[PDB]
């Protein structure tokens, strides 16, 4: 089950969807007219819409009075203490990949299916074009759409628990330090190696084309159960990225004979510091992120590779 | 798995073991005789390829000939080994185990690989104190790794091969670039221009695929690999695809020269414009017995053979 | 000096050029009309034009009688029989990169400047577009053009055969399906033994060639260097290396090696090297002058952007 | 000329060396005994020695009164005075030496104590004979190229670096967007962590960690290597030593960038700042044990394990 109503690779609703969360790219200019159009349309079939509190306080949305008549029907949440985990049937994302990551931040448990929309530039996780969006949204609502069960990593930080869920990767690297970083990595309680360099890009398949790909990791389809381990410019000619089964335990610590501390980041945010007495535990989460695909998983993955990463051009 | 054969359960006590020896070798004779004499003091039937018994260096010794007469002989010509062997012991190195996969095109009994000197990624058992190890495996206290294999069909205008490490399409005598098209689920995913591609198993991730820049994949990860051989494109990163897909490699219509297909570094065939290669994930894996557990053996192989992250 | 008259980076003619060599891409169809146009234009300034004998015996070169009056004024030469050597002031190439390689094959010593043309192919070493070729060829004839002196490798095979290679010389394994073990000496010292498909020891101008496919870095043709890059080694550490151009390389088969090896010179005639054979590689004293449209750096980076799509988006 | 007296690839002194500078790897307890032994030996041929002031300030250097008498003959300092340099500690010491000599650099005899090291080929065992042979003038050197870097702020600041210059991101977690120009021509913009524009000596450094090839220090070139670029086709490149590189921030760039010289003091560059990199005319001569190429391959074999088994 994914959300209060949606469940499952096709998508089934059982109960008709009535609550939708639209997530905007925060400070942007080209995403005002499409956001207004989408919100106006989504409430023409009497369907509850949710909007971040920080979006309605924007000066460029309160100034317009034509949209203000229909804006009052927003089930606003302030994100300070509101748990919208059990209140959303499916999500529409506007702006790019960074929006989808934020969509995974708000749902640390089961997450409803998402429908990412790309409006400008190119997105690897955003397959839907905003043109003719009415028909696509209607088809998604009816229940004729395929999804991919994108894996996520459950990460726990023990300081001498924080319980984060990450989508692309968790990065353990160096911050202001300009020297080598020595980090010990354990798999199932056994020391497998010590990385001596900028850091590691332990990731998910859907993060294989992310920052992991920049460091030399291979392209991994999101339909395989696997966990990547990829360095960041290691000071060793023979440390290639490795792929491990999804059902294993990963642990990451600072080696006892190490100078400087380490810095851990989750999808580019929540950048905190780990010292000698801290530990990071990584597993494969039981709550995947279903993202609706326009036609099918493999074709969308390969077209994203072709357009975004220019994989095998000429 | 076999007639009677993640832990290993025997159900029926093993009695028919096949010992595969590395041909054209001299350091393996004494361990081969020792292992064969030991395996036939528990009244357990052993199998040896016919070409091994006709070796001049093994017929010249009459001490081994007394126990040699109890061998069960197959010649690979018409005496194809079948669901009659429930335990395999391999001597010599990695290429021996590959041969073990060549002999069994269907379900394969569990295999024991011995590294008699040198180093082998797929050979984790040291020959020292082999009596206790073989006894423990015969009893039924041993973990196994189900290595996946690729089912390959060659259609010429069927061959039905099973491969362990990879299938390599490349160029032979040709010195020009090679253009071959690849289909995934009946869809043009790419055309590769260069030497070729090394579509492989996780077991082949550390093989010739690793030579071309492919990543390291544990044999417990259910996926198929696609890595090039020096492509004339900076962007063609090796890719990993689900095990349930079907790959179809052909020659592009606007392609000069023919292509050459090799299965686990073995018999090479030539494919022309009208030929196709279909690759899927086989339903008959290769159970390889591990000394202690899969992960530690894999990482020891990485550290000892490939020198993965030394110093 | 580069040829009988051309000399030197700007090109100085000293004596007015009168002998020109046009090299065609052999079996092709889209190149006949540009070849005919260039040949007709070249002899309206009273330029002696040299053409390969096999080109003039093509079926679609005498079937047209309009061009018949032109073929009578070609100084025909034949491969392996007549050595053109020091008789050509500068060369014009048509068809693509390989033609330039063939241009290096005909001149084992000093070679005249080459004005490469790309026709229906993009090409890394072919920077001239055939459009408005009259002004370009006139400007080159006058003597206002920049030149990139591409280094070449001098290779001797001892079994006393000598070759000059432009892109690289490749020592690899052919019909063998097993690993190839070959030993490399630098200045008489064992620096490495490689266990894999082979090595792509190359010139800078061959860096973007088959060397690049194997993971080599992009090497500008104005740096004096010799590359050594492998072909899929069975080792994660054997990163490609760059050595000074003034060194001696000597490649052999290791004593404990199975099978023989195969040596190829610029993707051409392949020889077999056994245990008793040796390959000696140095930097030649006869570079290949290649005329450039604007200047070496911008042309190199444009070739990287168009051909190899270096850093797109 | 390299220093007041040393000149040149063989090394010729012309005038007998008399002033030598010893550089110690800061606080390293393993180097105290070699430092004392070397300083005692160097002042038995009546040869002037130079030491950093902070080395004598070490609490565990005046406690031993045996070395105090030897200590009192140090020409301590807190150019044009040092004939050649002896380095103890490892690779990072040599870089520090290049920091002290922004102009002509005297030859350096690097020693590896407690570390293996790439640029430190001399073993401390039997150091008497090695130092004597160096003093006599029977030794070969390699002329390691350096990069001259000028930072222009919209305040000129010159620098000479030995390994590389790194233009990366600091605390920022987003991609860094920086434009690079060669001879006034925009060659590319890089979309990632940064660039590792380097020397051949730095080819085995942090540049090698990002996928750059090894270049022998006798090959004149300037390397450009990314740091995990967000592109599959940005292969590292080399350029002739005679070119001029100019790195800036693109006009449509978020966040700033940080420039680091050999792993030292980090500066911040805004949109109005520029970095100009050329090949310096003052190389760093480092004396070799036997010959350049064999020492380079020895360092590749035991430091980076290049092509093992
Ligand atoms: N060197 C690099 O390429 C680099 C550096 C830092 C962070 N990252 C990645 O950026 C992400 C954080 O996103 P942001 O907050 O900057 O938002 P964003 O959308 O601005 O992401 C930045 C860029 O990365 C791309 N991207 C993001 N996720 C991707 C994925 N899964 N596959 C392919 N491309 C992807 C985006 O399309 C965009 O081009 C993390 O996934 C992190 O790994 C990459
Ligand atoms: N460039 C290369 O690395 C290269 C070239 C050709 C063939 N191969 C491999 O050789 C094998 C053919 O077997 P053969 O009997 O002719 O050779 P072999 O058994 O003599 O193997 C040759 C080398 O490859 C290693 N090897 C073989 N299979 C391996 C695996 N699965 N993982 C890691 N290392 C492995 C062996 O340990 C040995 O070092 C195929 O697996 C093929 O991929 C590799
Ligand atoms: N895997 C590969 O990429 C590969 C394989 C074999 C040969 N080659 C190269 O092919 C050439 C043999 O000449 P041919 O007449 O058979 O080829 P060709 O003229 O048919 O050209 C083949 C391709 O290689 C490119 N190319 C050739 N030389 C180049 C260079 N110096 N820099 C960049 N790109 C270059 C061409 O642009 C074209 O794309 C040699 O340079 C050899 O290195 C490359
Ligand atoms: N990811 C990396 O590999 C990385 C990261 C930051 C800095 N660095 C390098 O560290 C150096 C900063 O100086 P430091 O005071 O930290 O010195 P250091 O001796 O502390 O350098 C750290 C490590 O780098 C090695 N090293 C340094 N220069 C080298 C070279 N030219 N070739 C091969 N190995 C070399 C040293 O031997 C040591 O193992 C710079 O050369 C910089 O490029 C490397």
Description:
- Chain D: Keywords: ATP-binding, Kinase, Metal-binding, NAD, NADP, Nucleotide-binding, Phosphoprotein, Transferase.
- Chain D: Belongs to the NAD kinase family.
- Chain D: This is NAD kinase.
- Chain D: It catalyses: NAD(+) + ATP = ADP + NADP(+) + H(+).
- Chain D: It is an enzyme of class 2 (transferase).
- The structure is a homotetramer.
- By secondary structure, chain A is an alpha+beta fold.
- Chain A folds into 2 domains: 153 residues, Probable inorganic polyphosphate/atp-NAD kinase, domain 1 (Rossmann fold, 3-Layer(aba) Sandwich); 132 residues, Probable inorganic polyphosphate/atp-NAD kinase, domain 2 (Tumour Suppressor Smad4), CATH 2.60.200.30.
- Chain A has 8 helices and 21 strands.
- The first copy, chain A, has a 6-stranded antiparallel beta sheet.
- At the C-D interface, β11, β12, β15 and α8 of C face β11, β12, β14 and α8 of D.
- β16 of chain A pairs parallel with β14 of chain B.
- The structure holds nicotinamide-adenine-dinucleotide (NAD) (4 copies).
- One nicotinamide-adenine-dinucleotide sits at the interface of chains B and C.
Features:
314 residues, binds nicotinamide-adenine-dinucleotide, 8 helices, 2 domains, Rossmann fold, five-stranded parallel β-sheet, alpha+beta, six-stranded antiparallel β-sheet
Question: What can be said about this structure in brief?
Answer:
4 copies of one chain form a homotetramer. Chain A has 314 residues and is an alpha+beta fold.
